[PDB]
A paper describes a structure:
To investigate the structural basis for the unique properties of TbPRMT6, we report the crystal structures of apo-TbPRMT6 and its complex with the methylation product SAH (SAH-TbPRMT6); these structures were refined at 2.20 Å and 2.35 Å, respectively. We primarily describe the structure of SAH-TbPRMT6 unless otherwise noted. The SAH molecule is enveloped in the deep pocket of the SAM-binding domain formed by the helixes αY, αZ, αA, αB, αC, and αD, and the strands β2, β3, and β4. (i) For the adenine ring moiety, the main-chain amide of V112 (helix αC) interacts with nitrogen N1, and the carboxyl group E113 (helix αC) and the hydroxyl group of S156 (helix αD) make a hydrogen-bond network with the amino group of the adenine ring of SAH. (ii) For the ribose moiety, the carboxyl group of E84 (strand β2) and the imidazole ring of H30 (helix αY) create hydrogen bonds with the two ribose hydroxyls. Upon SAH binding, the guanidine group of R39 moves inwards ∼3.9 Å, forming a hydrogen bond network with the carboxyl group of SAH, the backbone carbonyl of M33 of helix αY, and the carboxyl group of E142. The imidazole ring of H318 swings ∼5 Å to make a hydrogen bond with the carboxyl group of D36 of helix αY, and this hydrogen bonding interaction induces a 1.8-Å movement of the carboxyl group of D36. SAH binding appeared to fix the active site residues of TbPRMT6 in conformations that are favorable for substrate binding. Taken together, our structural observations and biochemical results suggest that SAH binding induces rearrangements of the active site that promote the substrate binding of TbPRMT6, thereby supporting an ordered mechanism in which a cofactor binds to the active site before the arginine substrate.
Numbering used by the authors:
A (entry chain B): 25 to 227, 230 to 368
B (entry chain A): 26 to 227, 230 to 368
């Protein structure tokens, strides 16, 4: 069932394709030393080896680490990949010198060139492992310093962005509920549709939203440089974005349906992320191919939704919002999304 | 919970069986129908569309209140009465009280047909059969009070539990080995065995590939829905004997095993059929998938991997005793136990 979740991630072709391409394009992998943080099945470790890495350290805390040793052996890669079955944090606690002392023969004169990881949670942050990736990065930079090696570590992915967009719920309601319930062998069961829908919204909605829900193409909220981001940043994630709904292609879709006296109402905001390396981008936008992340949608209170308290004339208007991504405890792995309209 | 109801309304097999039985039945038009556990009221509204004189729609949950609106939204309010109550509570009100409250709708003929979708997993588990039995008996008392002794037509009229021995290999191959064998040139097939084995130890409810059958299946338990009583649901067991020497399904695997070979048995799969007139609703692996899927009981992993239950390629005899036993007093929840011999 651990493996069932990993199988989900391995079936994510967009996810798989971004990492395979990024790894094959790095000029820092061949002949150099790679660390894979949170390696799971070891797929990224094994890709790095095939790409000609000198040696790979594959770090995995769970009991998958023991089976990964077997699969590495089954793929004849046991000399190029070392599995470390422990948390990043416990490896760190063992210290810089002890790391170098245990694996010096594999490190040789080279140090760590590349840090591979797939840490992204929902909107990058929620149920992710970014804080462990940051700790790993800082630790291996100290390991490099102790080896007298001064080259900075390549992060893959190297950059991450959070995107936000205002939505109307109508097309999600119509496509996922009303379309089915309105005609059940010629019977009108649409009253049941309103019910099923209203109660599912009172579950942070994590679902693949039809793109027609977008009232605007989306704006950047938070952007990260993965070589420089520090834990401190995860304590104050907030920004204010301004959606120009005038002359927005997305808004016009709905403006045409409203009629000349009609109004288009905002029911909430949907949130997604991109990460990138070199020429490659992995996107979880509703406009991109589906991924196991889907998107995360934050709704306005039902009072605001049903009475359409946030609405716009057919010509559009301006929509400002301040959004907070707030840690709900001290791990910085769990977050809540809070917003206030301008 | 309407999401579970959508799932049942999206089950094309389940829906066509009931739509066809109701629209092809000769006891509905001009007659009085009871829908026991009506939920959305689909079976009731179908009964009204088929020309029923009147329909009593019984639904215990708060769906009943919305069902009234939907009966109205489809212009059927004179033809369908929603009784938002448990079957058991309506019975407790007594016969004479029912007859007096609804005397004009019963008319002179009383209840002719009792519609219901009560089937759980392997017919019994998380099903609603005891309420259907109680309803049937109650409305036959109502009929008797009106001088009608004609027995009530049950839809479905019959139900059968089937069992068949299976091999796990094709399920392993199709749902595990095929994916894990090559992940971009990597052999992750070790992960495949682990995911598979660990999933088996967590009553397997799943769509088994038809190639898993070592035999077409035999009847374990058969019910006449006009006559079945609650007492029967406390002692459900039987013994079936599979002649694998005469099974086409076994011969299939015997050929793949080759002239020198053994065919191994990894467990038993259980499904059900219900029927009415010319129509059968089947949840067999050889039939289109339904939300019931099938239920599979595996032999101990020791037996499976050491192939402790096996047959030479010409076949042999496989006898098994099965118990379907209620795990509490509701007669809604059950476990399946089996012994080879
Ligand atoms: N602090 C930590 N130290 C070591 N492993 C960790 C960790 N936090 C999470 N993990 C592991 O990191 C993995 C992230 S899922 C990523 C799996 C794999 N790299 C892939 O791309 O397919 C999980 O297997 C989890 O067990
Ligand atoms: N003892 C009981 N008395 C009245 N309603 C019951 C009941 N037990 C279960 N129900 C209701 O019966 C329904 C059965 S599932 C819905 C069946 C519906 N006729 C269909 O074929 O789609 C559920 O809505 C449940 O709430």
């Amino acid at each position: 069932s651990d493996l069932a979740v990993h199988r989900l991630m391995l079936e994510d072709a967009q996810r798989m394709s971004f990492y395979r391409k990024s790894i094959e394009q790095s000029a820092s992998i061949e002949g150099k030393v790679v660390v894979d943080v949170g390696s799971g099945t070891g797929i990224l470790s094994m890709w790095a080896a095939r790409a000609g890495a000198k040696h790979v350290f594959s770090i995995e805390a769970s009991s998958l680490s023991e089976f990964q040793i077997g699969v590495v052996e089954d793929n004849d890669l046991s000399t190029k990949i070392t599995v470390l079955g422990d948390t990043v944090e416990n490896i760190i606690a063992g210290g810089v010198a002890n790391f170098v002392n245990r694996h010096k023969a594999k490190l040789g004169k080279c140090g760590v060139a590349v840090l591979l990881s797939e840490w992204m949670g929902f909107y990058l942050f929620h149920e992710g492992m970014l804080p462990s990736v940051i700790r790993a990065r800082n630790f291996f930079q100290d390991v490099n310093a102790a080896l007298g090696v001064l080259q900075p570590i390549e992060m893959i992915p190297e950059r991450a962005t959070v995107f936000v967009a205002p939505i109307t719920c109508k097309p999600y309601y119509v496509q996922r509920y009303k379309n089915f319930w309105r005609d059940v062998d010629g019977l009108d069961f649409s009253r049941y549709g309103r019910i099923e829908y209203e109660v599912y919204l009172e579950q942070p909605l994590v679902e693949c939203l039809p793109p027609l829900c977008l009232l605007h193409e989306g704006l950047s909220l938070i952007e990260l440089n993965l070589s420089t981001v520090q834990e401190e940043v995860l304590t104050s994630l907030h920004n204010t974005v301004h959606f120009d709904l005038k002359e927005s292609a997305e808004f016009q879709q709905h403006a045409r349906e409203a009629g000349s006296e009609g109004r288009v109402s905002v029911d909430g905001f949907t949130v997604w992320f991109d990460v990138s390396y070199g020429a490659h981008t992995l996107s979880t936008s509703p406009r991109s191919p589906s991924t196991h992340w889907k998107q995360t949608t934050i709704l306005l209170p039902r009072e605001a939704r049903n009475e359409e308290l946030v609405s716009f004339p057919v010509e559009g208007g301006e929509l400002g919002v301040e959004m907070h991504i707030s840690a709900s405890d001290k791990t910085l792995r769990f977050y809540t999304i809070e917003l206030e309209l301008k």
